[PDB]
Design a protein around this ligand. Sequence first.
Ligand code: SF4
Ligand code: SF4
Ligand code: FES
Ligand code: FES
Lengths: 633, 633
Amino acid sequence: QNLKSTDRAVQQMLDKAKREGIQTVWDRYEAMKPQCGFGETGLCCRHCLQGPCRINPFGDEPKVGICGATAEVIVARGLDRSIAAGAAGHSGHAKHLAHTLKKAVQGKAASYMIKDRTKLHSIAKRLGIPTEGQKDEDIALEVAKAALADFHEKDTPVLWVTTVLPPSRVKVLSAHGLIPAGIDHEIAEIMHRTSMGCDADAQNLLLGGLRCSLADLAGCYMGTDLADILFGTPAPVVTESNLGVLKADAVNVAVHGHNPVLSDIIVSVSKEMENEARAAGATGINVVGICCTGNEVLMRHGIPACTHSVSQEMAMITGALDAMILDYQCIQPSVATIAECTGTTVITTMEMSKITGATHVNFAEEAAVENAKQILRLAIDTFKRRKGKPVEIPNIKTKVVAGFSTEAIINALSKLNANDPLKPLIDNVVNGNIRGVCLFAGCNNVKVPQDQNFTTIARKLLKQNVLVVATGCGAGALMRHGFMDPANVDELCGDGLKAVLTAIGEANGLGGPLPPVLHMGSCVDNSRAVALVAALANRLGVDLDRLPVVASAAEAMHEKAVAIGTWAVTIGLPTHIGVLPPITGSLPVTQILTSSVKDITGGYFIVELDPETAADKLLAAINERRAGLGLPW
Amino acid sequence: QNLKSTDRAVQQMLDKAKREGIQTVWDRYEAMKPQCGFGETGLCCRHCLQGPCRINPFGDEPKVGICGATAEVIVARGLDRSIAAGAAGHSGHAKHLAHTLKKAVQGKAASYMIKDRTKLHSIAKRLGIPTEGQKDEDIALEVAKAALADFHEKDTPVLWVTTVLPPSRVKVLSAHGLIPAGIDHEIAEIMHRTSMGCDADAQNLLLGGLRCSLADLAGCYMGTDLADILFGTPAPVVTESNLGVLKADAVNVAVHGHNPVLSDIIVSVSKEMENEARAAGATGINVVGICCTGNEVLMRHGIPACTHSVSQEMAMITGALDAMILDYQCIQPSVATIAECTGTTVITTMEMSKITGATHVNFAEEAAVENAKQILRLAIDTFKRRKGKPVEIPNIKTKVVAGFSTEAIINALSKLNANDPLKPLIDNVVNGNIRGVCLFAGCNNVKVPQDQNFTTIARKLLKQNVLVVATGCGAGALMRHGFMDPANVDELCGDGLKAVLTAIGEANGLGGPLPPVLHMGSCVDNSRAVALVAALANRLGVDLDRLPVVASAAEAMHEKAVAIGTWAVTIGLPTHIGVLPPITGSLPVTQILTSSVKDITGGYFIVELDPETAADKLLAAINERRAGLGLPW
Ligand code: SF4
Ligand code: SF4
Ligand code: FES
Ligand code: FES
């Protein structure tokens, strides 16, 4: 089972699923082998009913699509649609939060409110919305209106791009026509230009993809901004991760998906139904996180993380998961059939994300508390149905220190330099105690033994004094293997990084270091890493493509992860991807994405499936940036 | 060659391409055989990097996608994305025209203007925009603003849906949540909900697809409305079609694509450069149409149609096509390589639709006349380069009567009843002289011998007294085979239909009938057929799903054609498709789309590849509707 997952709790549940005959994502993967090589290389097109068209990577015909589309065009069009789909998910999430904020301050949903006034006012200021002499509810109404306005064309470009990057970067992007005009506008223009008989030039297509990836960035940053207003900006928190955070004698409720508009309420309501849970025989209601929605409530409330991404079914296999409360994105639809076997109540809540066989509860912000109670009462009923049934919760968990929003990181650094908080970080980059920064992002992928790339790469970088930050299921992988536990700094970190983590920790009252890896939150919270890197750029007076900062989507899966990787390139970062995107069937497209895009944005993809080799390539990229700054390396 | 195309001019050019070694769309099709059956049946998914996933239609594993996605989900998600892509093309076209209109009346593009004031005021009235006491430029600015507003959420739904269908139909659709909130909003929500780990219920997914198809309808109707304001509403016109409209001694310039914002200007400018063309040795500039842009200028100006859709390369093979001026959509990218062999100058004009190897001219409304002159001067230079070269223009053309906008049809009928113009049509439906109405729409498809389904089905319906209207490359197929020539009424039409065509024609001064088939314009001008059918419904006080009206996308290809077929179903029509959409791998999805959707919208798909059988099925659907109205059949 260690070929399937490096997580020992997952291995234990894989054994249980095997002897119980429950098919898993790994079993469905094995049944899919050998996979189609045309699709794997990108040399397949179904964009019209003359298809499917495929192209042999090598050999004889077919060499060209039926309409004349070359390999270059087919690969670029498929890639562009994946970016647009990712942008559609992150920005649909943000759009939902924008409507929630508007409702809240219009008096239409009293379960929601402005919790972070400071964040609200700074966002308003960033956008040029006046605050002086204004009601908070009116400032927020203006912010929500501005958020919704960025989805369409207007007299300004997308402000959640142009106001969040340095002016020099906006200038570079504008010169190449890469600033989005509107988030949904760009998504639609991608779908148009990639449809049959439209755009048929690889460079033109890919420039469109870069622009659409910035629409994805805008959606991420908008989602983080709005969630922080509504639910609070994260600060350091201590909790735990992995299946051992389940409790046989509690009602175990997983929140799973992405948008916490529901699950932040589930958290608060669950606390108030403790006595109702005790009346039914439980100790209380044990809310645990899966995937991004779990990251959101981990960051804000210290809710323990149960599992992530590829191993999500395994939480159900314990037999102790009484309910799984779903919104959207990254939910394996198998959970609805597995629930028949495990007893778990799977509940969908969003109109546009239903799963056949799951119970649907039509969540409305107007009714959030009542919806939560309905849902948790199904969870309580399910807990009662498993009175006397044995469960198998692996007794495996790690300690997790998390909550490192960019505001929190700045505050932590400010204890070393109150009026120039980024300077202590830059000082230690300059003197080599910090070699660079690496952001781990994205999913697990059934093709890669779960977590193996994240942990292999992170271990090598940490020993080379790289400051590692993480989001999404990259953070999930790292937390479940101990990388967010400060007790592991001695083992994992080079001496210079240890010195810095310790200096910052001891200045924040901890008597111990910061953890080896800084958890910056959910996938939309990749925007937080952008805020940090942009602030560093501004403090240094350089653009992001001169900073020793890289990104790694080491086990990427979702179209959202392709979008994030693409905007990391577009904003200037060397960006590793540890799974093959469907591009190897076109050398010209591969060359654009890994090489000549450097001349456009200064970033570039590093495609590398071997994680030891990927780490060396990422270190080389960091060190090239150090050399460009005149720094030792 | 008659297995490839039923058009004799196309057959002749296929022989020429064969002996010259020029590969065609039919050759690239042959090289693609056998095509992938997983894609053909819809049982393939590449929506994440764990894929590709396929499902065997029958037999053993793989039976399910790696994430758990069933055949039903995979097929519905692929279909939904095709609808969104079609919606993105028709509404990108409309959006462009909306910006052009705004520019025109803001004084920013004097080559454009309000040409149809009557149309402008009636659209304003339909939308609830005040006209009394307003400048035309201000009415138009408001109409353009309303058009752009329908692309995003706002306090009203999409007005180019809710103001163009009968209130009873809007009520049925609203009750099922099918009215779009915004055109690009729905496109993005499709891409979101079909991404990995989101919507996974076939019925829910397909309801989303129906709503997105109405976003496509809105884009079509907006495009027709705005083009009529800017360029004039079509009225009856006489011209010709097929390759014989090329002239060896003229500069032959094809306008090809969809959006006529450029090609309407090309037409007017070409007339003024006649003397410059004569100075270079030509008789003049001969502008001819390909695909929809050609339909647009055929309808408004009587520009002859050269060819359509699958046979577009054949215009170049004559050797006489001096330039091909492209905007976007349905342009085989092969034309850019074929041009090397044929001498043709292929010119792209739109930023988001480029073709490697073609010359690009960056058209701007602000500069339309100057751009046109630059483009036509390249065409003149190319004409000069072929001094003394033999050309092979097949001497094959048909006479075409076209221009039957809905306003024109109403005006024609009004000569039989001035104050109740629809009543003569309804009278003849009631007494059986008109059995029903059939709209032929959509593309040619290399899988079907070109035009064979359109002409086979049309011949059977016309003999059964069906009033046949046509758009797009369906109109192209019918015009090239003589179905728009009134001289063929005796041969083609049943006696009752002949009587009606003759009565209307003789009342309009013609001394002859209307043509056998009424050309209602381009693909967005399928919206004109909706206006006609909606007006009939309103006059009868019934919904569209009680009218004896059907649609046939008899040789469909483009994602746009899937979108149109889907909104024809959604607004209440029995809708034939003569090529397999990728749905046969899921019987549940097939059953929804061909049967249980009747219970939602009253329309339904008729999937039938045999055209004689399709005609019988369409007649049965028409006759069932007649029976529901209590009419003989
Ligand atoms: S768009 Fe071109 S390459 Fe794609 S399926 Fe259609 S014919 Fe084939
Ligand atoms: S979304 Fe599911 S079915 Fe599609 S490729 Fe990914 S794992 Fe396979
Ligand atoms: S041929 Fe397998 S992905 Fe299309
Ligand atoms: S397996 Fe051929 S279309 Fe994917």
